[PDB]
Write a protein that binds this ligand. Structure first.
Ligand SMILES: *Cc1c(COP(=O)(O)O)cnc(C)c1O
Ligand SMILES: *Cc1c(COP(=O)(O)O)cnc(C)c1O
Ligand SMILES: *Cc1c(COP(=O)(O)O)cnc(C)c1O
Ligand SMILES: *Cc1c(COP(=O)(O)O)cnc(C)c1O
Ligand SMILES: O=C(O)CCCC(=O)O
Ligand SMILES: O=C(O)CCCC(=O)O
Ligand SMILES: O=C(O)CCCC(=O)O
Ligand SMILES: O=C(O)CCCC(=O)O
Lengths: 458, 459, 459, 458
């Protein structure tokens, strides 16, 4: 007999111990330790009762990489990127990723080491782009003797929340262009009507989270050029290309959306979205060194590489840099093209199967990113007992997360549902999703009474 | 017999018999085409060999070792995006539980079950959130008083970590710096108060100053600030930058009054990936109460009955560091944290005392309160020495160590110092290897007949 | 809920919160008592961190990389004792097949299916077996002729590897050395013959001289020895020390007559753990035929139809390397070996040519025939330089490399040279990293206003 | 259809390929490559049809280490010990192992860094000990003006073959002292009768491979002291403690066999036997630096450690050094004592169960190493139709290797069987062995006719 079996000794079975008869700590650190096996199960077992990542169809963020990328990143778990003097090869590798991304966006910058910065995601990358735009504008107005205490920026109502965070945490006024059925993306004329002497930039979006579409950056550039020539306000573009920045160079190389455009001075992207790297990666590039203010930034030479030192974060995992460089070499341009081709084709397939179903109609006929949205046909929705919120709940019962939500301003009456196709979501998994949707439709159509969300829409 | 595509990357290719491994890695542009995973894996991996090994990086404060079970747990969470809280509500609750545990480690008087605080990637984000909040609370007060609010400043030691300079740059807030001297090796509150005025948004004492390893005396600052605030009505608060010290003091110095026990400490930040014992990617910031976190910055969403504050500079991010932090709280508990930090501090104190015995060296402080310390050359020894600590740094790097030498901040910029940080996973046996290499390096440098370049640069 | 024995090593102990990790590792005496495996694992593992990583060790000729399948196969054989041939007869046969394959790579004319040869731990044991065999054949021939046989000698370049000095010392056999000059950068046959007499047991040309990377011309020696032997009747044979070149020449230089194609080459040795591409612990020695391996040294036992020679200095030993060798033969074949060695030699030639373009350097040879080469400072640059190749070695060590600087053997002792060995797993990309580090080290060393200790020691 | 499926492409199944219809190469390197999976199987599959290491009861060499030792050694597979400038911490660790072994043997040497050498096994360690003994004798005889060209050494007929290799490869005369049932180990007086002015050393054995016994080193030391004072020949002892060198210090600390004895000037041992490390480890220690000739050796200071550079091998795996240092720290003295206690207890147990069986009688009543030998009772053997060779074959049918062999000279008529108990052979496995032996006896006792080996004994 083992006296200390239940107390956590060498013979203890995790699930015959006192600790596994006790709740996990909510408020205070436990007074004492447990065995690693007990602690591992206590933390791990709490993650079972939620969405499995590969079935999370709400997220744009990578939920699969191959075995070699995963191994490489796991092996780098203890590498702090910011220790660049200690790890100068990763600092150089970061600079090469930035060069590769800037050249993917057709940067005209002649310096070997392109002007850009590592980020944890598009959040930090967007804020860096916006702060730079803010500082360039402050300096311009100061030289002109104009006031500089009431800046604004212009964006679609389809903005992702980081631009609201940017507005709040820096106290810069956000001016929003509404969406309508006639203008499903940023309309340049309406955007221009909100520009004045205090606008620091206009922010078109490539891969709008709410809709899956792309704002027309070239059309914005065109309108902005004539306006800037009229007023001298010199208003630039920052492209929020969180998803599209790793779609368009491979699948739409001739679409002029990037540094080929005169007024596109900076671009940001989520490397952890369609850059195909696990969470923790964004990039922001400037068209040239002259668009990155000295007040924000400096550069350090590491092994002959000029590495720009700008960022909101400091210490951070380096794994995602290795992961990014791995994807660039392992796939190359052709490999990225074929992976994004697969993701886009599966999205268009699901899009076309959704359109064949009696309850549904797609927001757009054109799928330009590996995602799309649909809603209930208005005449179907009128007499239906259910809403898309009910469909989301039905699908979650099979482990899927397929989100239903209302669109931004002037389309707030439209409840839509979104599917994001990422690498690792196959045609076979699409068929399973489509079968579950068909079954959910059949069950919901048996309702004799309206659901609560159906009643709330009345 | 012969395999036609052996060199081009087929199923029979040997990585190092291939054309790709006769070619340089891409510097400017994505390669046109793919390679095999094995080739690409080696191309990226092999570039990380020629640099400091993490366990021998003694410059860094950030965790380079966790146990096998924490490591496995975090690797298994590599594809989990924290910010997908609706999809992963159990991790959102776990995040709120870590914040509670941290706030209570800091003796928060907040009565709400779900404490006011936020996840961060490191003390960089956590400090900026603390500073933006102090700035917004100050703007609101001055606006309500009819006073100007366009020229904010904050007060901090010259021993600040660079994120406070970034904060000053990226928000255009004036940083006022209190210099270090040998008479005042940490932030002196009276000199701190001399830089306070109606435009001061907060004072930032530091627990675990990166340059020196010391702690600013937060309680002494709180006392001076209390009298000053009673005199002026400016209501200047404290944000404690406890990047390292926030996970040392609760366990090793429970009676040092530095945290939410003090009247004017309204927020505190810490690096979970330093002495919180989690691999890179974790910080925490807590507020003394919900009233100190402006609604302009923040909201909260209920996930499975837990009120989780949605404030942050980042959005999508790895969730593994939350599982790792919660694992350490459960696996070690208070006693286990105390015993690990005791080990790290004892080893730092051991090296500190061994350093003091060697003829060329003298310690900046006799008090080791965090698992790190700094030393410099005895002035009388340095005058006739042919070498500097930069030469010692280079000697040690030849054996794989990174032991950094650098000049101290303002009014001590003449002092070249060297720093050793003891982290979990750096043992007494490894300290003996370091000390042996230091002794051997000293004996080699003492044979020099001519001064080194850095020695001449000091002349 | 405190754990009383947490620091003493129970089921809850954290390695780096334990008393054991506050104590030094044992230097003199076995510790009195046990620890947990996790603690002991770290204590041993952590001592290996502070040294050169194998893939950046450019001094070594010995394999530092094999693919994942070879590595898995060898790890799985860690508990297999080769010498237990009755218990493990398939490995004994596998060893015999490896010996057959090596003998045929060297164009053995031996008609027996099972070639006469022996497993070794490296070229050290393989060379000693070859030399003892030559010594015994010589003793027997001199005895039958009624001549003395008590003062044997052998002839070799001053570029010998240290095993031949051990052979000379441990068997008390006189080693006669032919010096190197710039005019005779490898073994000159005429000078070698002038050191032969009636007591010379063999001449040892070297394929892959460690000091230089060059090949002694075996065919020229064989030709010279043939005429010498016809004149004197001394009947002196060749043993080829082909430690590196024995797995280079068959694939990249098939037409160079250096092996058993030559009349007087009676035995050849090689390091299987060098360019045979197997992890440490493998060498081979083959004889031209059974009549050249004395029965006094040897016997043969039949295992499963395989005639296995039982010759060796070692007895019990790891079997993993046999599996590793046979795997490489099957996995790569002739073509795969050819392409791997081609990559290594091409990268060595690439580094060789880039070094020649740098102002301080000049290469020892314009011919690169093994995946390694040496260079030194241009005499005119060296006169006024403040630094030596020893200073460059130390600088490159600061980035984790080991690139050795050393003086050449006799009559070239004045030459300080530096050597790079390119092994499987050293790519073009890693070469670019090395060359970049060299360029940077030169620019730093060129800033010196005073000479270094080694530069002064050169007077 | 996949055109290249059988030829080795990415879709090839190893056992649907042409290569797995072809024999493995016997004579010549294949002209071309295969896939790693095919090559892995081809080599691996050849190792199945032989004794499994844990059931190999012939071997004295370690067949089990724990998971941490095993992982530690695997991780060092690419580490060449001899690169001591590159790997100076392993050179220091090697020196610490030599110190620990030297003190385990009660070395009186005052130096911190004990005089000793790493080996691949007892073979190299014994040859180093014998070469040193040989060189010291040459120097002594030369200084006296005496001849030194006809060396000999004295050893039991129970020598292990390396001493024959030493005799052959160095051309030194081996003088053998026979075993008898009256003198089951080396008799000192018989040993002394073969010594003269040309004897370089006497070699007692601790853990004789043939018998499991220990030569009485202390009795040899006493007799050698009186002989040396009479003749002045100054003949020393080298102890071949291949097995016993890691048994006696823990289980028989009071037995005086090591450097405590005046004439024991060197001792060798197999670290890969009862030192508990996987194949590839030996040690030799000298009583002091004056007993290791400089002609054989030099010393290099690595990080303050004086490391002796003597050895027959050069480049070699360093993994075994880590494994040895791991075992010293992981087990300590107590842990070694308890592990060797277990192995010895199990051997004593099997020994006692063998003695109870009608056909058998043990060679010795005292088990002093974890091994022993037995033979057939003389009267049982006379009428039995089977021999121990037949028992060996029967046990091989169940996967065991339990060897039968004739003892060396003057016991050449004795066919014996040996069992070696190593770490990893438990009481439970001993019961399994004993059950198979019992079953085998019942089968062989049914023979109506004698076996080939039984007739060969007639
Ligand atoms: C992803 C997203 C963001 C926020 O990016 P993160 O990578 O989550 O930090 C901003 N804008 C758009 C269009 C996005 O899709
Ligand atoms: C670590 C550090 C910081 C920055 O924190 P990160 O975790 O690197 O983001 C700020 N202040 C101090 C005192 C620090 O030690
Ligand atoms: C490698 C080497 C040796 C010694 O061989 P090991 O494999 O280290 O035992 C002998 N001669 C030459 C030319 C060598 O390169
Ligand atoms: C093991 C053995 C040897 C040979 O030792 P290895 O470790 O196989 O090289 C020599 N003598 C005895 C008594 C042995 O048991
Ligand atoms: O992809 C995600 O998980 C979040 C980023 C986009 C969004 O806000 O929905
Ligand atoms: O610990 C690190 O690796 C960086 C922390 C902040 C600093 O030291 O400036
Ligand atoms: O390659 C090695 O690691 C040793 C080889 C022999 C030598 O260089 O002397
Ligand atoms: O134990 C072995 O595997 C061989 C050891 C030497 C022997 O007993 O012959």
């Amino acid at each position: 007999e083992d006296l200390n079996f239940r107390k956590g000794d060498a013979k203890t079975d995790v699930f015959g111990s006192d600790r596994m008869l006790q709740p996990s700590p909510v408020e205070r650190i436990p007074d004492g330790p447990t065995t690693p096996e007990v602690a591992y199960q206590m933390v791990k077992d709490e993650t079972f009762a939620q969405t499995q990542p590969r079935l999370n169809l709400a997220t744009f963020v990578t939920t699969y990489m191959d075995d070699y990328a995963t191994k490489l990143m796991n092996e780098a778990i203890n590498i702090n990127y910011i220790d660049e003097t200690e790890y100068p090869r990763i600092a150089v590798m970061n600079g090469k990723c930035i060069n590769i991304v800037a050249n993917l966006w057709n940067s005209p910058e002649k310096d070997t080491w392109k002007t850009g910065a590592l980020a944890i995601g598009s959040s930090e990358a967007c804020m860096l782009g916006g702060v730079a735009a803010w500082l360039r504008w402050r300096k311009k107005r100061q030289a002109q003797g104009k006031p500089f205490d009431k800046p604004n920026f212009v964006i679609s109502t389809g903005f992702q929340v980081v631009w609201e965070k940017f507005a709040q945490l820096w106290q810069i006024e956000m001016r929003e262009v509404p969406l309508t059925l006639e203008k499903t993306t940023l309309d340049p004329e309406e955007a221009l009507k909100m520009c004045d002497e205090n606008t620091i930039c206009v922010v078109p979006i490539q891969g709008v989270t709410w809709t899956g579409l792309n704002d027309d950056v070239e059309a914005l550039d065109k309108a902005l050029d004539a306006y800037n020539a009229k007023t001298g306000y010199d208003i630039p573009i920052h492209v929020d290309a969180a998803s599209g920045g790793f779609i368009l160079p491979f699948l739409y190389p001739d679409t002029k959306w990037d540094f080929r455009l005169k007024w596109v001075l900076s671009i940001s992207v989520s490397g952890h979205k369609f850059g195909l790297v696990y969470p923790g990666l964004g990039w922001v590039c400037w068209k040239g060194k002259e668009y990155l203010p000295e007040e924000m930034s400096f550069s350090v030479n590491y092994l002959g590489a000029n590495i720009t030192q700008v960022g909101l974060n400091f210490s951070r995992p380096a794994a995602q840099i290795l992961g990014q460089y791995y994807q660039f070499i392992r796939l190359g341009f052709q490999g990225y093209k074929e992976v994004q081709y697969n993701s886009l084709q599966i999205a268009k397939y699901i899009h076309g199967e959704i359109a064949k179903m009696a309850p549904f109609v797609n927001y757009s006929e054109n799928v330009v990113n590996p995602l799309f949205i649909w809603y209930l046909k208005p005449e179907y929705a009128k007499s239906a007992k259910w809403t898309l919120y009910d469909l989301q709940d039905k699908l979650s019962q099979h482990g899927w997360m397929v989100p239903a939500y209302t669109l931004p301003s002037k389309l707030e009456d439209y409840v839509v549902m979104r599917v994001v196709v990422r690498q690792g979501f196959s045609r076979d998994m699409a068929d399973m999703l489509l079968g579950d949707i068909k079954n959910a439709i059949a069950e919901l159509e048996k309702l004799d009474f309206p659901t609560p969300t159906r009643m709330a829409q009345e």
